[PDB]
């Protein structure tokens, strides 16, 4: 129960803050199946920040949970596909940690709306 426009502005800013935590930009775009042809064998719903931006603008995020669910998919897909001893797996752990703080603050701002 709030205005749509300020909420989407908040999600756009939050998405930007999450992208800033991904300093290697390993989650900015979909995982390239050209270089990872087996990626879809067990990853049933790939996700990335560019796709999240498309979903945001397509009005697919009308509450904080749905936005946060796709961010969590970025993290969980990466933990699932990659071995624990890789840079990619550790990057997903770090994103989960740093992104979670971004999300908790942004959700507190949405709840004031
Ligand atoms: C090249 C680029 C990205 C990746 C990748 C990134 C994150 N999760 C799985 C694969 C692998 C090879």
Curated annotation (Swiss-Prot):
Which disease is noted in the annotation? Answer: Intellectual developmental disorder with dysmorphic facies and ptosis: An autosomal dominant neurodevelopmental disorder characterized by delayed psychomotor development, intellectual disability, delayed language, and facial dysmorphisms, most notably ptosis. Additional features may include poor growth, hypotonia, and seizures.
Gene transcribed to yield this protein: BRPF1
- Species this protein is from: Homo sapiens (Human)
Tell me the domain of life.
Eukaryota
Give the protein's recorded name.
Peregrin
Give the signal peptide as a residue range, or say none if absent: none
Covered range within the whole protein?
627 to 739 of 1214
Q: Where in the cell is it found?
A: Nucleus; Chromosome; Cytoplasm
**What is the recorded post-translational modification?**
Acetylated by KAT6A.
Instruction: State how it assembles.
Output: Component of some HBO1 complex composed of KAT7/HBO1, MEAF6, ING5, and BRPF1. Component of the MOZ/MORF complex composed at least of ING5, KAT6A, KAT6B, MEAF6 and one of BRPF1, BRD1/BRPF2 and BRPF3. Interacts (via PHD-type zinc finger domains) with unmethylated histone H3 at 'Lys-4' (H3K4me0). Interacts with trimethylated 'Lys-36' of histone H3 (H3K36me3). Interacts with ING5; interaction directs BRPF1 to H4K4me3-enriched chromatin at the 5' of active genes. Interacts with KAT7.
Any idea where the Bromo domain is?
2-106
Q: What does this protein do?
A: Scaffold subunit of various histone acetyltransferase (HAT) complexes, such as the MOZ/MORF and HBO1 complexes, which have a histone H3 acetyltransferase activity. Plays a key role in HBO1 complex by directing KAT7/HBO1 specificity towards histone H3 'Lys-14' acetylation (H3K14ac). Some HAT complexes preferentially mediate histone H3 'Lys-23' (H3K23ac) acetylation. Positively regulates the transcription of RUNX1 and RUNX2.
Quote the tissue specificity entry: High levels in testis.
């Amino acid at each position: 129960e709030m205005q749509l426009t300020p909420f989407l502005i908040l999600l756009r800013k939050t998405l930007e803050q999450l992208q800033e935590k991904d300093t290697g930009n390993i989650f900015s775009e979909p995982v390239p199946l050209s270089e990872v042809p087996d990626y879809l064998d067990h990853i049933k719903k790939p996700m990335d920040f560019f796709t999240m931006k498309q979903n945001l603008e397509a009005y697919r995020y009308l509450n904080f949970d749905d936005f946060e669910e796709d961010f969590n998919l970025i993290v969980s897909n990466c933990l699932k596909y990659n071995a624990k001893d890789t840079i990619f797996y550790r990057a997903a752990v770090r994103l989960r940690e740093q992104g979670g703080a971004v999300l908790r603050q942004a959700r507190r701002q949405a709840e004031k709306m």
